Structure 1
Amino acid sequence: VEYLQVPSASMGRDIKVQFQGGGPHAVYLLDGLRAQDDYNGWDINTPAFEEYYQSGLSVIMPVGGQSSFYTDWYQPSQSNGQNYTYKWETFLTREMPAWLQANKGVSPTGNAAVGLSMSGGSALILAAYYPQQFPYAASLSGFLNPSEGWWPTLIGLAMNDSGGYNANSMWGPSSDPAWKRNDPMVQIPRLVANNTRIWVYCGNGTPSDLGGDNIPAKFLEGLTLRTNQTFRDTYAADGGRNGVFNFPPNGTHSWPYWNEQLVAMKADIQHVLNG
């Protein structure tokens, strides 16, 4: 596994990327809400790299972007002294794939975006707007209707609690178009039109022997399950026909279950991306 420094002109800094080669197409493994600046949470908490070693797929783990939602923000987060504007969608769709193509031979098209929690919706949004780059997208316990109802408030609370980040610096006031633009439920017609292969998982809040037995992990999983079930219904009602929906009667908002899903989807990704 290599630790790379990839310049981001749009953010004015270098972004650390953990990288395992192994094929021209890649799985982009996006982090959760509390992404650290040293290593991606997939590497800290799971054997993701080992599990995809010799899979015929490269594995890309960008590092950093706490509370970023892997999106382009309007402005720096005001409350916590951020001195630049997050531009993580520009980085993921323009800057990083160009760098990996030139230097590693990773194809900028035909890749998979895999997100969990915070980035579950991000992965679907990336596939909705960049279908040539991401014919495959997985959302593990994602928040799939962020513009609806109380979700902007809940997202604002969680972002302020995880590092003091300001959701209004990200997508503006709740009536700003950026909220619906980045709402996977709203963008289901794009996923259908693109025939995106989507893998949508959410547990029910009940731990198994995999662990993750704590109240916040149980609560968050049960909370977002309802949104995920609604997403499944709306996808089918809108003509969606290329989805895998995994809602087993177990699982909390914790890394063992996300790893179990990453392993489970490997053959699916291999078949879609490599044939």
Structure 2
Amino acid sequence: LPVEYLQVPSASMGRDIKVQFQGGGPHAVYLLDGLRAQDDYNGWDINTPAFEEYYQSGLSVIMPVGGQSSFYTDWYQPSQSNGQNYTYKWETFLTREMPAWLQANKGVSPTGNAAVGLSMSGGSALILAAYYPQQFPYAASLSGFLNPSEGWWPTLIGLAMNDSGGYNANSMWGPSSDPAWKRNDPMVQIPRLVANNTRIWVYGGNGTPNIPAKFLEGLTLRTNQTFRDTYAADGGRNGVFNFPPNGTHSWPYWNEQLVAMKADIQHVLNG
């Protein structure tokens, strides 16, 4: 398999970002990582056969490497405690710096692509489509945080980020009253997704991959149901909602969904 590892300079983050890449078409699937993203390889390549599954699909595959607990967003400041000596600017990287580099050097189109995320980056994918519809007419969220600004979620996200590399949610989007929380909330941005006619693919699993597991499961179930209902209520007509009883929040089932959506992405992006 013709998989490459690239070093893509980020002016905004003052460092080179590693990117795993497989070509095969002008349009690409951006495969975003989970909460515990490592600096050597993207979680999709560590845990799944994603590259082989999309080989000769007519689509390129882009796996950015790094950004533990980053939510693939532009942060207010360096994270307080874990000694981060720069500010995460991953929205700037994914929407400006990386597509410019791939276009200039490889001919990958900056427009007409898919953003696919899981866990932490499920919401990221929807937000990227909400604000950059020309770049991402297609977005998939697999076990994402669909309402991060509401209820228990700012606290739970803060706890998760701290457990994953000691990152500080306050440095990212401020206190939960800060406008950045609603700005980056897929539920709140459903009207953008509808206006843009974004093709969205939303998966939620069940079960358990402190606070009792059943309580957390109840929160996840309710928020997922609210997102689906609100999308329909707001005029949404271009979504796929997959909530199978036996689905889990795990790489094997996230891969099952990535395979299931391949025909969907091919038809939407390549006709």
Alignment TM class, shorter chain as reference: over 0.9
Is 1:203–1:222's contact at 8 Å kept on the other side of the alignment? no
2:12 and 2:179 map into 1 onto residues whose CA distance is 22
1:218 and 1:37 map into 2 onto residues whose CA distance is 33
- Give the counterpart of 2:264 among 260, 263, 268: 268
* SS of corresponding position for 1:226: helix
2:40 and 2:126 map into 1 onto residues whose CA distance is 25
Which consecutive segments of 4 or more residues in structure 1 shift more than 3 A? 214-223
The 1:196/1:228 distance shift into structure 2, 3 A limit, reads: same
CA offset at residue 150 of structure 1? 1.4
CA offset at residue 77 of structure 1? 0.1
The 1:146/1:265 distance shift into structure 2, 3 A limit, reads: same
TM-score (norm 2): 0.96
2:137 and 2:244 map into 1 onto residues whose CA distance is 25
CA offset at residue 225 of structure 1? 3.1
**Which ranges in structure 1 are unaligned for 5 or more consecutive residues?**
208-213
The 1:219/1:58 distance shift into structure 2, 3 A limit, reads: farther
CA offset at residue 131 of structure 1? 0.1
- 1:38-187 to structure 2, matched below 5 A, reads 38-187=40-189
**Which ranges in structure 2 are unaligned for 5 or more consecutive residues?**
none
1:203 and 1:180 map into 2 onto residues whose CA distance is 24
Deviations 1:148-172 (A, max 9, x none): 0111111101101111000000001
* SS of corresponding position for 2:75: coil
1:219 and 1:203 map into 2 onto residues whose CA distance is 15
* SS of corresponding position for 1:108: coil
TM-score (norm 1): 0.94
Is 1:206–1:251's contact at 8 Å kept on the other side of the alignment? no
Is 1:28–1:61's contact at 8 Å kept on the other side of the alignment? yes
CA offset at residue 253 of structure 1? 1.5
1:98 and 1:221 map into 2 onto residues whose CA distance is 40
Is 1:221–1:252's contact at 8 Å kept on the other side of the alignment? no
CA offset at residue 226 of structure 1? 2.5
More moved, 224-233 vs 40-49: 224-233
CA offset at residue 218 of structure 1? 8.9
* SS of corresponding position for 2:212: helix
Is 1:101–1:107's contact at 8 Å kept on the other side of the alignment? yes
More moved, 76-85 vs 222-231: 222-231
CA offset at residue 251 of structure 1? 1.9
The 1:39/1:218 distance shift into structure 2, 3 A limit, reads: farther
CA offset at residue 201 of structure 1? 0.3
The 1:73/1:215 distance shift into structure 2, 3 A limit, reads: closer
* SS of corresponding position for 2:256: helix
1:267 and 1:216 map into 2 onto residues whose CA distance is 38
Deviations 1:96-139 (A, max 9, x none): 00000001110000000000000000000000000000000000
Aligned position for 2:216: 220
Is 1:4–1:17's contact at 8 Å kept on the other side of the alignment? yes
* SS of corresponding position for 2:134: coil
Is 1:218–1:253's contact at 8 Å kept on the other side of the alignment? no
Is 2:206–2:249's contact at 8 Å kept on the other side of the alignment? no
% identical aligned pairs? 100
1:61 and 1:217 map into 2 onto residues whose CA distance is 31
Is 2:208–2:249's contact at 8 Å kept on the other side of the alignment? no
1:115 and 1:187 map into 2 onto residues whose CA distance is 17
Deviations 1:195-215 (A, max 9, x none): 0000000112289xxxxxx99
